[PDB]
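ERR on first pass: missing label on line 2. Operator R.T. fixed the label and resubmitted. Corrected input:
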Amino acid sequence: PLMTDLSKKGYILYDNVVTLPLTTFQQKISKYFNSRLFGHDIESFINRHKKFANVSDEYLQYIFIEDISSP
Amino acid sequence: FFGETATGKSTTKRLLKSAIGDLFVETGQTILTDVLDKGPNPFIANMHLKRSVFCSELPDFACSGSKKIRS
Amino acid sequence: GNKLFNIAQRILDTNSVLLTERGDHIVWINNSWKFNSEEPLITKLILSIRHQLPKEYSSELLCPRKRKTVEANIRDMLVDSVETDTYPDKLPFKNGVLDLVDGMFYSGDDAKKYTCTVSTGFKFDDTKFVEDSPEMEELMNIINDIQPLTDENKKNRELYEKTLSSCLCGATKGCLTFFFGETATGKSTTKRLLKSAIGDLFVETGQTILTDVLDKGPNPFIANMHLKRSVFCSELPDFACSGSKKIRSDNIKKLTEPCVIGRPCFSNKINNRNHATIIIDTNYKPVFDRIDNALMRRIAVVRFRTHFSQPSGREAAENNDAYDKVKLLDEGLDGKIQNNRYRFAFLYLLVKWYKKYHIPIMKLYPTPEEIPDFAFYLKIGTLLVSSSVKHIPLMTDLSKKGYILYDNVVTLPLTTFQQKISKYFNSRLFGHDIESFINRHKKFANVSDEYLQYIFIEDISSP
DNA sequence: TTTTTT
Ligand SMILES: Nc1ncnc2c1ncn2[C@@H]1O[C@H](COP(=O)(O)OP(=O)(O)OP(=O)(O)O)[C@@H](O)[C@H]1O
Ligand SMILES: [Mg+2]
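pass 2 clean. output:
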């Protein structure tokens, strides 16, 4: 039911699961975390944690707490 | 058994194990996704005359790089 | 009244057989404690002690089966265990114990109160344990040839005669010694002399105890040094060549602790007592995996600078920088050493040296200056000082030098650190050290912000 | 893998 808020931020629900654009995860990670010191951790997280429903869409099944805050 | 979080699924484990005792046994995800005929496997020796075996806390296998179950 | 039971009781009342913490049985035979896990020493004691028993008991011990019965009784009556090897300043022999404090020699019951489970393996002789003897005059010549009595070599000679005298003590030593020198300098002659001096208390092992893991499976090379007082490792390879393994930095830390974990074959005992001085003779200086402060306080080095050469190759030897003097070689010395000619004179000299350095207290100290690998880590502590709260008021001067305040702490960004550090160390020879150092102490305030928590001492003095 | 261990 919270997608009513997520759609206000432009977030999307594809294949009946909530997903965010990838570029959004890397900009949030860069804006809150230092790339130089945790690049290996971020890369391992993304590589071992990526999910896809078809040959074109790749997605993660998680939502930032900051996204729940009202815009 | 399929369900969501906080759904008494782990409670039924306790109700069954209290009802059975030592015969009831737990297992993890280490053995179901790995070949049991290769290398030592204490579980292969352990299930000897066990009455029931329960497997839970399975990580989602849809993630890329997560090694799916071996049928 | 069972006769054999009475014999067992009388034997037990003499305190001639004891049970140890490790489960062994120690027997007092021929003025020495002996033990062995494969031979029946108890029956030997029973047969030997028969002369002290009354005449109606002695004839009963001639039958082996009755000796086995008495052995079974004695095993049944031993229910409590005792400690062994608690006196560090006693030197046990095959027929007595020598006191290193006063110099007296004890035999019989006087030596029994010191429960020593090891010995040199040969009998003590007071006739040859004297100062005035032709062998002593000969031996002093070799000792002076190896270590000259000159002013530049004084400190090294004192360290040399401290490490050797440290081998008579049965305590734990906190440092390892390296005998460094070029070929044909007498490094092995002192090893042979010390072996002939101390007998069974000497042991030589392989190089795996400095390179491999000591606690994977059976390892007799580490379990054969239990209760020994001198351990030698010989001829480690040169690490410049490819494929050579380096010395485990954490292995030498375990060799300093009083207890060492190791297991023999077909054994369950995993604890070994550390009483040994560890000496490695080398032709190349050692290389370690990691350098830290805990490593630098456990290494000592002794130099050898005298060359013994045949007359054919003398001319080259005088043109080598690695030598300070050249002397003619003696081709008959090794046979004399192998014949134990200089045994008791070297023992007397070792006792004389022991009275000079270790009577108040016994301790060994490291010499970190000798190793060239440490020279970087030693120098940094004298050039960089850690940031402190007291340095805040002085930053008015530090602003002109390029220092920046971050989180109310004096900080210096990476970009300006390199040219400051290049004023002391050359890039080519110390590139790997400063790279490793910078990566192991870099801190970032943000994605593009860099800073280090050190300040130079030369920067707190006004130029 | 094999000495290890039995
Ligand atoms: N004082 C001495 N006078 C004459 N010859 C001596 C003296 N001391 C030792 N030598 C002789 O020097 C020779 C070489 O010494 P030694 O083998 O101990 O040298 P080293 O430096 O330990 O050698 P390496 O490490 O290569 O085995 C020996 O044959 C020995 O007899
Ligand atoms: Mg030698």
